[PDB]
Amino acid sequence: SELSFNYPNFQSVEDITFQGGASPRNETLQLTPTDSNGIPIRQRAGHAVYSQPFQLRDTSFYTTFTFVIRTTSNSPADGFAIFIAPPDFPVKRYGGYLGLFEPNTATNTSANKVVAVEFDTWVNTEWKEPRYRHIGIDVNSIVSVRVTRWQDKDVFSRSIATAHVGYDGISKILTAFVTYPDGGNYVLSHVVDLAEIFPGDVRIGFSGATGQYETQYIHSWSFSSTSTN
Amino acid sequence: SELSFNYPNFQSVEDITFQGGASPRNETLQLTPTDSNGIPIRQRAGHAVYSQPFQLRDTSFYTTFTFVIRTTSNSPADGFAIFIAPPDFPVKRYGGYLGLFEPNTATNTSANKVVAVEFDTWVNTEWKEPRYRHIGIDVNSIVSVRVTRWQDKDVFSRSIATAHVGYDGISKILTAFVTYPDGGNYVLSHVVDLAEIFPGDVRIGFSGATGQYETQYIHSWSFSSTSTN
Numbered sequence A, B: 001s002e003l004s005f006n007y008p009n010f011q012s013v014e015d016i017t018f019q020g021g022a023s024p025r026n027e028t029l030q031l032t033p034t035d036s037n038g039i040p041i042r043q044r045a046g047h048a049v050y051s052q053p054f055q056l057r058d059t060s061f062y063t064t065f066t067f068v069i070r071t072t073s074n075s076p077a078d079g080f081a082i083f084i085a086p087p088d089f090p091v092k093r094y095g096g097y098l099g100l101f102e103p104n105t106a107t108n109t110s111a112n113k114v115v116a117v118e119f120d121t122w123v124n125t126e127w128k129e130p131r132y133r134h135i136g137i138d139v140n141s142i143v144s145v146r147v148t149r150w151q152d153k154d155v156f157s158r159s160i161a162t163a164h165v166g167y168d169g170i171s172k173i174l175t176a177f178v179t180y181p182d183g184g185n186y187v188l189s190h191v192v193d194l195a196e197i198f199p200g201d202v203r204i205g206f207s208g209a210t211g212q213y214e215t216q217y218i219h220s221w222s223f224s225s226t227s228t229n
């Protein structure tokens, strides 16, 4: 279906729903919480999602957002993702699960219905993932179907980074381009029929998790979807 | 292989190779020529190509540029493209061939080695294309393998528009995202193994053609390629 929205900042959150440990703070989406001294709280997850459902049948979409990861250590955890799931998808487990999965079914594709672009700051050995920090595309599993190295100079830049995420409903291809000012550029694509996975309604939004010594912020976000008929 | 470059504008055109009717003009790349009164000259083609070659085996790349199409009537022709080609690729035919094909082989995928993202202002009936202005991915043929409607409001906006083109060398997927400020967003993707088409050096650049009543300008441009090792 057709939907568009545009948040240059989050002084308004009229149509944003916050769950779990996410909240609106300093004109941003703050995905995980901090205590009264600004210290990230451990083992928390949260979601900030656009509140209106949409459909993926015969649809392409384009979305772009800017983000900051604030780390206070050389060993931050766990990252964040932009995701799509049914409208009643809840905040799931903290830590390496990124608010999107739970331990007993995290790598079981038949037990999940969630697609995401993850920004993964903590190398987990509890399931298969690369031995360095990475950006990936997740289809129904915490084990990414396409994954690439995220350079530490970018992870730790404290820059306002940009993501572009698009879905071509004709070719059935999800793509992310991530850019850093005077930094790295990242390109990932994967063939996935989202309308097959999601024959009804979905919502799009962000999930963040700790971990430790890391807060994830969304500074701006826009979206448009169009019929491919 | 690895290459990066950045033109925030075209005050400098070092390492741009101009061919045909393309020239530097007013800190932009002007792809087709105008007379000393600024009127678009009919039936002309022009290339503006980054001078240094790169290779596609085990490589991904990201590139972005801004552009303006100036029209002097409601019947502009023919558009422009960003393209990759082997060394010493010549300026080809003006008109609907976009500077990238010759009439006798324009639809023959066995007789061309050129990959492009085209912005097509003139509906041609001499070969198959949509009945409306369109953005397309071209693989070895003027008949686009993935093609989408380009809305006239955007064509005639006089806006500085942005294109993002990415190639994921692991999944073998070329993607374009095109955005207009306060206008349309466009998403196209295609599965193509570029290293199989281009086994040696390639160069990246722009080709523009008339036609009539149209000049195509590139205002800024950046590019990075990295190894998928």
Ligand SMILES: CC(=O)N[C@H]1[C@@H](O[C@H]2[C@@H](O)[C@@H](CO)O[C@H](O)[C@@H]2O[C@@H]2O[C@@H](C)[C@@H](O)[C@@H](O)[C@@H]2O)O[C@H](CO)[C@H](O)[C@@H]1O
Pocket (backbone or CB within 6 Å): A077, A078, A094, A095, A096, A097, A122, A123, A124, A125, A126, A210, A211, A212
């Ligand atoms: C599955 C999960 O969410 N793990 C978290 C978790 O992992 C840590 C943590 O469990 C501590 C408890 O003392 O023990 C380990 O450090 C564990 O990390 C795991 O094992 C280590 C030895 C390495 O192999 C590491 O790759 C692996 O993940 O907490 C951390 C933050 O401390 C993250 O939040 C993980 O995702």
Ligand SMILES: CC(=O)N[C@H]1[C@@H](O[C@H]2[C@@H](O)[C@@H](CO)O[C@H](O)[C@@H]2O[C@@H]2O[C@@H](C)[C@@H](O)[C@@H](O)[C@@H]2O)O[C@H](CO)[C@H](O)[C@@H]1O
Pocket (backbone or CB within 6 Å): B077, B078, B094, B095, B096, B097, B122, B123, B124, B125, B126, B210, B211, B212
């Ligand atoms: C193949 C090519 O490069 N076509 C150009 C060309 O096409 C014109 C042109 O050939 C004039 C010359 O008198 O004749 C026709 O207008 C032709 O347009 C073609 O035929 C018409 C009837 C339509 O069906 C149209 O879709 C088709 O292109 O010049 C035009 C600008 O006038 C463009 O530059 C084409 O790409």
Ligand SMILES: [Ca+2]
Pocket (backbone or CB within 6 Å): A118, A120, A129, A134, A136, A142, A144
């Ligand atoms: Ca991961």
Ligand SMILES: [Ca+2]
Pocket (backbone or CB within 6 Å): A078, A096, A120, A121, A122, A123, A124, A129
């Ligand atoms: Ca992880």
Ligand SMILES: [Ca+2]
Pocket (backbone or CB within 6 Å): B118, B120, B129, B134, B136, B142, B144
């Ligand atoms: Ca065309």
Ligand SMILES: [Ca+2]
Pocket (backbone or CB within 6 Å): B078, B096, B120, B121, B122, B123, B124, B129
């Ligand atoms: Ca045409």
